[PDB]
Amino acid sequence: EGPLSVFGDRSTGEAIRSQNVMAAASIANIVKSSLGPVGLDKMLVDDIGDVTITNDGATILKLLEVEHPAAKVLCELADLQDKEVGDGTTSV
Amino acid sequence: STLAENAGLNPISTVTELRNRHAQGEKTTGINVRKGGISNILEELVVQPLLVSVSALTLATETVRSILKIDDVVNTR
Amino acid sequence: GRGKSAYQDRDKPAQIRFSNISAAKAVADAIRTSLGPKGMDKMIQDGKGDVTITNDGATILKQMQVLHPAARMLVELSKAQDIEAGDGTTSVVIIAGSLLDSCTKLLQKGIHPTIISESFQKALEKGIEILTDMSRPVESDRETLLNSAATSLNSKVVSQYSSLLSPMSVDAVMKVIDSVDLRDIKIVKKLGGTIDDCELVE
Amino acid sequence: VNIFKAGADEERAETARLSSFIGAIAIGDLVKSTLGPKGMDKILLSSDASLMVTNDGATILKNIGVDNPAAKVLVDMSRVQDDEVGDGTTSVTVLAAELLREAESLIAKKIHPQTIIAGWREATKAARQALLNSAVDHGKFRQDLMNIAGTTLSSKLLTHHKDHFTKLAVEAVLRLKGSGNLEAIHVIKKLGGSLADSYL
Amino acid sequence: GEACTIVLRGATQQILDEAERSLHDALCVLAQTVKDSRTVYGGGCSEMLMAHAVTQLASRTPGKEAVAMESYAKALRMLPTIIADNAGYDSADLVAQLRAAHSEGKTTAGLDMKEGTIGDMSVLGITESFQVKRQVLLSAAEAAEVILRVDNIIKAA
Amino acid sequence: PGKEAVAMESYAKALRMLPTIIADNAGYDSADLVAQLRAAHSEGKTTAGLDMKEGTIGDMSVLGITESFQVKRQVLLSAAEAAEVILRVDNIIKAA
Amino acid sequence: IIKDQDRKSRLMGLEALKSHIMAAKAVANTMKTSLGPNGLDKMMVDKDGDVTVTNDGATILSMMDVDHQIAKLMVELSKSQDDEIGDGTTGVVVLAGALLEEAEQLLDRGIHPIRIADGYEQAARIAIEHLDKISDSVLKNTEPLIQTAKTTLGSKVVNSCHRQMAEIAVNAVLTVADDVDFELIKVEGKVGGRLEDTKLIKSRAVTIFIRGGNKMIIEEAKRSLHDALCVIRNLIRDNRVVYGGGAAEISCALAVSQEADKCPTLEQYAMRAFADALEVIPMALAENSGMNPIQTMTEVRARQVKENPALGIDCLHKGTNDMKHQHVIETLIGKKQQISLATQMVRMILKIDDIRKPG
Amino acid sequence: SQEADKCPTLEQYAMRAFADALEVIPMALAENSGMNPIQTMTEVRARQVKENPALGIDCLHKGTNDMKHQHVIETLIGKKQQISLATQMVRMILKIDDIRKPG
């Protein structure tokens, strides 16, 4: 068969569930260094060239060009966590 | 098998476990994917209309026979 | 030599049967992971981009571009099973892939495809017999009606108001009982109030 | 230094016959799966999404885009057979295939094609003239008429109720018999219900 | 009366076309039966008889013509051979069982797919229209000649 | 009947090769000889044999062409049984 | 260097010679397979899709896509063979290629092409001269005329009623036999009825009304009739007729060789090489029939010296047989023409050692 | 097979498989005899349960027939030991999941 022709995603078996972990890992470790009074800010510079140096994990996940769907889940958590209490966004 | 599988229970083991209890218990004797073992489904409030079943066997069975007959698949281009 | 049209497929008996079984079984084990109350959803992002995260086998196969014919057969089982019963749409496919799995063994042994097709059919007649032979015969009775309407509205979001959705589903059918035709039961989702205010307009 | 253009065909002597027979036989063995009673239809699909599941050989040989000339000769046979009677269309096609296969077999054994034909024309007529003096003139005998009918309804999807329709065909013709004018027997195809509900 | 409007009713429109198509043809052959009260015998019996006759002819006939007539007969034994395969029964065991029981059971010994064995067609109820087989022996046969005669597939460009 | 048929049949056809080759090494077509001999054998009884020096079927007893029983008998008995065993083997260990 | 623009090929001596020998000899062996009664038809399928299954060469070389110059010539021999006498359109094509298969060898001996024409031409003449000797001179003899019309209508889609067509052809020619002329005998087919309803509209003018089933079947009856009107017109214009089947070619092939001995010089090998080619025809007959061309030929040659050059090859009885007795005769102009066209044609081949291939 | 059912546990499928491996000998007989191994076991397993196990496969007549009558008897130790030896060895190998062989 030729279900989804060229340019088509679809991950099954361990090949995927794993990819999700590493996906959440790289993302996590990122803002992981931005928690605490000595938070290590980052300089998010999107495509248009706009420089954005922030400390909040939410603002970082909302300006971070993410491609994998699973990793986007963390960006949603940072969203729900930001519109309910704020800080600790990185913790979640 | 898939049930116990998508539940964490050992498919193969859970099955044979049911096969036996199915001969000792009753037809209702099924697998409660929420207790980790066999149990009387009729008392667990889990029943489906005989139609869904009846159909299931017929639907897929005929198909398996419809493509098992096709001895050729040539349709130019 | 040049008996077939330029660019053309010609699978022989032993060659074709293999492909079909493969295509199907592959499609089966695909949705065989979403079956059950703990099934797994599958994000079906087509070309345009409109994602369709569904757990139902039918909805999954109806959103999936299917190039090979043999696997399209399964898509037909899911659709039919979802229009002849509704639930268990994922079962018909899985079982189908299994029946094909075991028969192949027979094929690679020395059993003519026909005999097999005849045998399986004979078992089908026996299967339906036993199953129905031990099914608990129920009653018109509005009681048993609310049983297939209540235990069928749970596990979902309507479970919060299944006690109300069941009665309406029973009155909606009790009237269209000219056999029941699902075309006489017009459904209209409106935005106002809550699901507890719902009403069945005769 | 070339009789034909860099794009002209003209297989000669054997090359052509060898290529011709194979072309026909191949097609003959194709529909050779739906011969006589009980068969395996072919779900044909052109190139415009026109899926068609048919058991009849003629219908199959007409929906398939054949490019091999010799093969087209078979489609003619399937067409001619279906135009005169109907059934057996799969028989005539397959038979021709085999005949050609046997033929090329003799050619390899150094046997002029014409010599083979002569021999084929001797047995062929011998076979026909034989069926005539070997058959039996039964009877308007409905009993036999139902046997011929039931043998033509089987091998298909109607095989489940071949019996029911067997009485409908033998009654519709027996009534208009005497001149066999089918143009009088109108058929009304109506979607719905089972095949066992049909009436005359 | 002098007309009969047969109203067919099937499951889907797909089975309706077939049901109508099958009827039309089922009526065509009957037109052949009403114009000829003759009936041969199925179960490859007919051919099996020819396969033997022609053979007896391809024996007392010298010259390569014996070979041709021999290949012709064998080519006919394919009808019953395939009838067995498509059924699931071994042709080899059938070809021999039918062939030998044919020279002993006359033109009344045919193949029975439902029983996977050779039986009597005249007593089983298996009778076919003579017109059908008549064509077959005249259409198929002679046709193979043309394709057989053509030893050059030429063309313009 | 049974597969025994085709076997016994293929056995006979394998015995026709003798004269077939006798015609080949004569320059005389065998295909025509087999038919000429086989057909003329069903009419001339067992006294129908091939005559290379004439390029046509002739009477064996009239030409004084007679072999000794022992000869043929041994052959038929030999090859046959011997081959049977050869056909009973389906896995041998020889050399590379 | 590039002394000429690369758009016009140019072979040198044996370069072109050889290319023509094969080419003209190739297309020749194409028609040989369709020579005789048991001729093997051909299936011409142009770039349109119209299948053309015919036996006649002129009808095959007309659909045949031919770019090769030498091959074009072979198309004009068969074409001119059908516009004059008609019958035996393949013969000239097969004979021509044969004269090449023999000429080539001579060329291998170093025998210059031009010189090769000598024997071929000197022998050809005497060949046609030997025909005027073994030719039968019939008489308004309605009998012999109709008999010939039937021999030209045999083995065609009009052999089922060649008796009626023969009568129509003989009367149509006799009424305009003012000194006949095939310009006063028009034809005209029409669907309806059978081939037995064919009549003769009257008579220095005759309208042949042909009836037949399909449109194709009629076209063959009209084609067999056309050749029937030509053959009858040949005999009436020349009281000379011979016997086909091969007998003739065997007589000449024999006479030529003998004459080749009485004539010294290189023209000797040529004539001989010419006669041997006069065997390819009879040989081809036994070929397309099913008999061994080698065994038959020699068998017919031995029986041809014992029973005069009246015996040929019976492609229906498989063996030697007298054509005259078997009623297998052809007009004299035909054979007299056949040799010419083919031969003369061939003479050109050897006279061409260049070629400027277009594309 | 029946005893495999009377005793569940994963050993159930095992006993079943074991039994299936006890059909090879017969199936093979039909195989080496020329008769279709499957079609043969068809008549065997059938004619066997009906007329006691005293019936087997007659490779001489191609089909089923009472062995006790065909005089095709064999000591009990033959079969008895046969199952043993084969079972014991196969078992050993089954316990072999690694073999380091130098050289």
Q: Cα torsion at C164, C168, C171, C172 (round to 10°)?
A: -170
Nearest CA in chain C to A3: C66
Nearest CA in chain F to D106: F31
G29 vs D: CB within 8 A: yes
Distance between CA D68 and CA D72 in Å, rounded?
7
Q: Do H9 and B12 touch (CB under 8 A)?
A: no
Distance between CA E43 and CA E106 in Å, rounded?
13
Q: Which residues contact F53 (CB under 8 A, 6 or more apart)?
A: none
Distance between CA D78 and CA B52 in Å, rounded?
44
Q: Kindly report the backbone phi and psi dihedral angles of residue H12, in degrees, each rounded to the nearest multiple of 5, phi listed first.
A: -65, -55
Q: Quick check: do A and D touch, 3+ CB pairs under 8 A?
A: no
User: What is the helix (H) or strand (E) element at residue E13, kind and residue range?
Assistant: helix E13-33
Distance between CA G352 and CA G335 in Å, rounded?
26
Radius of gyration of chain E (CA): 20
The amino acid at residue C9 is D
Distance between CA E132 and CA D135 in Å, rounded?
13
Distance between CA D53 and CA D158 in Å, rounded?
14
Question: How many C-beta neighbours within 10 Å does residue E62 have?
Answer: 17
Distance between CA D7 and CA D155 in Å, rounded?
45
- Binding residues of A are 36, 87-91
Of C180, C80, C132, C119, nearest in space to B54 by CA: C132
Which string of b and e fits C103-131 if b means at least 16 CB within 10 Å?
Answer: bbeebeeebbbbbbbeebeeebeebbeee
Q: Do G64 and D10 touch (CB under 8 A)?
A: yes
CB-CB neighbors (< 8 A) of B29 in chain H: none
Q: Provide the β-strand partners of residue G53.
A: G43
Q: What are chain D's partners, defined as 3 or more CB pairs within 8 angstroms?
A: B, C, E, F, G
Radius of gyration of chain H (CA): 17
Q: Which residues contact H98 (CB under 8 A, 6 or more apart)?
A: none
Question: How many C-beta neighbours within 10 Å does residue H45 have?
Answer: 13
Is G48 in a helix, a strand, or coil?
coil
CB-CB neighbors (< 8 A) of A5 in chain C: 65, 67
Pick from A3, A9, A12: CB nearest C67: A3
Q: Which residues contact D66 (CB under 8 A, 6 or more apart)?
A: B76, C5, D27, D72, D75
Q: Do D111 and G33 touch (CB under 8 A)?
A: no
Note whether B18 and B30 are within 8 A (CB): yes
Note whether G166 and G156 are within 8 A (CB): no
Q: How far is D71 from chain B (nearest CA, A)?
A: 14
Distance between CA A52 and CA A54 in Å, rounded?
6
Distance between CA F47 and CA F62 in Å, rounded?
8
Within 13 A of F35's CA, how many CA atoms are on the CB side?
A: 20
Between the two ends of chain G, the Cα-to-Cα distance in Å is 22
Distance between CA E12 and CA D191 in Å, rounded?
6
E154 vs G: CB within 8 A: yes
The amino acid at residue G275 is A
Pick from G43, G71, G290: CB nearest D115: G290
Which letter does DSSP use for residue F57 in this model?
A: E
Nearest CA in chain C to A6: C47
Which letter does DSSP use for residue F54 in this model?
A: G
Which letter does DSSP use for residue D188 in this model?
A: E
Q: Kindly report the backbone phi and psi dihedral angles of residue D44, in degrees, each rounded to the nearest multiple of 5, phi listed first.
A: -75, 140
The token pair that represents G290 in the structure block:
């099913």
The amino acid at residue G260 is A
Distance between CA B33 and CA B37 in Å, rounded?
7
Note whether G232 and G148 are within 8 A (CB): yes
The strand ranges marked E within G315-357 are 319-322, 329-331
Q: Which residues contact E70 (CB under 8 A, 6 or more apart)?
A: E54, E55, E58
Which letter does DSSP use for residue C54 in this model?
A: B
Is C157 in a helix, a strand, or coil?
coil
Distance between CA G169 and CA G191 in Å, rounded?
20
Of D172, B34, G261, G183, nearest in space to E30 by CA: D172
The token pair that represents H18 in the structure block:
């074991």
Is G187 in a helix, a strand, or coil?
strand
Note whether G170 and G139 are within 8 A (CB): no
Q: Do D38 and E73 touch (CB under 8 A)?
A: no
Q: What are chain G's partners, defined as 3 or more CB pairs within 8 angstroms?
A: D, E
Q: Quick check: do E and F touch, 3+ CB pairs under 8 A?
A: yes
Distance between CA G285 and CA D112 in Å, rounded?
12
Distance between CA G142 and CA G171 in Å, rounded?
9
Nearest CA in chain C to H39: C111
Q: Provide the β-strand partners of residue F50.
A: F57
CB-CB neighbors (< 8 A) of E86 in chain C: 114
Of C92, C23, C80, C88, nearest in space to C55 by CA: C88
Q: Provide the β-strand partners of residue D199.
A: E7
Note whether D107 and D15 are within 8 A (CB): no
Q: Which residues contact D63 (CB under 8 A, 6 or more apart)?
A: D44, D46, D50, D52, D54
Q: Quick check: do E and G touch, 3+ CB pairs under 8 A?
A: yes
Distance between CA E26 and CA E11 in Å, rounded?
20
Distance between CA G248 and CA G232 in Å, rounded?
20
The token pair that represents C1 in the structure block:
């030599």
- Biggest alpha carbon–alpha carbon distance for chain E: 60
Note whether G121 and G343 are within 8 A (CB): yes
Distance between CA D192 and CA E9 in Å, rounded?
6
Q: Do E73 and D123 touch (CB under 8 A)?
A: yes
Note whether G236 and G229 are within 8 A (CB): no
Looking at chain H from residue 3 to 62, which residues have their Cβ under 8 Å from any Cβ of chain C?
Answer: 36-38
C87 vs B: CB within 8 A: yes
Q: Which residues contact D157 (CB under 8 A, 6 or more apart)?
A: D55, E15, E18, E19
E83 vs D: CB within 8 A: yes
Q: Provide the β-strand partners of residue E110.
A: E119
Is E103 in a helix, a strand, or coil?
helix
Question: How many C-beta neighbours within 10 Å does residue G192 have?
Answer: 8
Radius of gyration of chain D (CA): 21
Which letter does DSSP use for residue G180 in this model?
A: -
Q: Do C114 and D38 touch (CB under 8 A)?
A: yes
User: What is the helix (H) or strand (E) element at residue G105, kind and residue range?
Assistant: helix G89-108
Pick from C9, C10, C85: CB nearest B55: C85
The token pair that represents C196 in the structure block:
């507890």
Which string of b and e fits E135-146 if b means at least 16 CB within 10 Å?
Answer: bbbebbbebbbb
Pairing verdict, β G329-331 and G241-243: antiparallel
- Biggest alpha carbon–alpha carbon distance for chain F: 54
Q: How far is E132 from chain F (nearest CA, A)?
A: 30
Question: How many C-beta neighbours within 10 Å does residue C12 have?
Answer: 12
Distance between CA G88 and CA G335 in Å, rounded?
9
Q: Kindly report the backbone phi and psi dihedral angles of residue A10, in degrees, each rounded to the nearest multiple of 5, phi listed first.
A: 160, 105
The token pair that represents E120 in the structure block:
């009597």
Q: Which residues contact A54 (CB under 8 A, 6 or more apart)?
A: A41, A42, A44, A60, A63
Q: Tokens 């393949």 label which residue?
A: G90
Mutation choice for F interface testing from D110, D112, D116, D122 by most F CBs within 10 A: D110
Which letter does DSSP use for residue B38 in this model?
A: E
Distance between CA C42 and CA C30 in Å, rounded?
10
The amino acid at residue A44 is L
Q: Which residues contact G329 (CB under 8 A, 6 or more apart)?
A: G136, G148, G151, G241, G242, G243, G244, G323
E156 vs G: CB within 8 A: yes
The token pair that represents A68 in the structure block:
């994998």
Q: How many helices (H) and strands (E) does chain G have?
A: 13, 9
Q: Which residues contact D180 (CB under 8 A, 6 or more apart)?
A: D173, E30, E31, E32, E34, E35
Of A7, B73, A12, D31, nearest in space to C72 by CA: B73
Pairing verdict, β G51-54 and G42-45: antiparallel
Q: Kindly report the backbone phi and psi dihedral angles of residue D42, in degrees, each rounded to the nearest multiple of 5, phi listed first.
A: -125, 120
Of H29, E30, G66, nearest in space to D1 by CA: G66
Q: Kindly report the backbone phi and psi dihedral angles of residue D111, in degrees, each rounded to the nearest multiple of 5, phi listed first.
A: -145, 110
Q: Tokens 């076919």 label which residue?
A: E128
Q: How far is C89 from chain D (nearest CA, A)?
A: 24
Q: Tokens 């309803």 label which residue?
A: G197
CB-CB neighbors (< 8 A) of G48 in chain E: 156
Note whether G111 and G270 are within 8 A (CB): yes
Q: Tokens 């080949």 label which residue?
A: F24
Note whether E18 and D158 are within 8 A (CB): yes
Long-range contact set of residues C27-30: C-beta below 8 Å, sequence gap at least 24: C27/A1, C27/C61, C27/C66, C27/C71, C27/C74, C27/C75, C27/C93, C27/C97, C28/C74, C28/C93, C28/C94, C28/C96, C28/C97, C28/C98, C29/C94, C29/C97, C30/A12, C30/C60
Note whether G59 and G79 are within 8 A (CB): no
Pick from D32, D101, D158: CB nearest E22: D158
Give a three-class secondary structure readout of C71-111: HHHHHHHHHHHHHHCCCCHHHHHHHHHHHHHHHHHHHCCCC
Distance between CA H35 and CA E90 in Å, rounded?
11
> Using CA of residue F38, residue F40, residue F45, residue F50, what is the dihedral sign?
negative
Nearest CA in chain D to F32: D111
Is G314 in a helix, a strand, or coil?
strand
Distance between CA F28 and CA F32 in Å, rounded?
8
Distance between CA A87 and CA D49 in Å, rounded?
58
Distance between CA G200 and CA G207 in Å, rounded?
6
Alpha helices in E58-112 (DSSP H): 65-76, 78-85, 91-100, 102-105
Q: Cα torsion at C56, C58, C61, C62 (round to 10°)?
A: -120
Which letter does DSSP use for residue C5 in this model?
A: P
Q: How far is E88 from chain C (nearest CA, A)?
A: 5
Distance between CA G153 and CA G163 in Å, rounded?
9
Looking at chain H from residue 26 to 55, which residues have their Cβ under 8 Å from any Cβ of chain B?
Answer: none
Q: Tokens 């064995």 label which residue?
A: E117
How distant, in Å, are the alpha carbons of C52, C74, C93, C105, C157 from that of C60?
8, 11, 12, 29, 20
The token pair that represents C181 in the structure block:
């035709």
Between the two ends of chain D, the Cα-to-Cα distance in Å is 71
Q: Tokens 């399209």 label which residue?
A: C72
CB-CB neighbors (< 8 A) of D184 in chain E: 2-4
Which string of b and e fits H9-23 if b means at least 16 CB within 10 Å?
Answer: eeebeebeeeeeeee
Nearest CA in chain B to H5: B20
User: What is the helix (H) or strand (E) element at residue C23, kind and residue range?
Assistant: helix C13-31
How distant, in Å, are the alpha carbons of D103, E28, E123, G175 from that of E101?
28, 33, 16, 69
Q: How far is C192 from chain B (nearest CA, A)?
A: 33
Pick from G38, G65, G357: CB nearest D4: G65
Pick from E63, E64, E152: CB nearest G43: E152
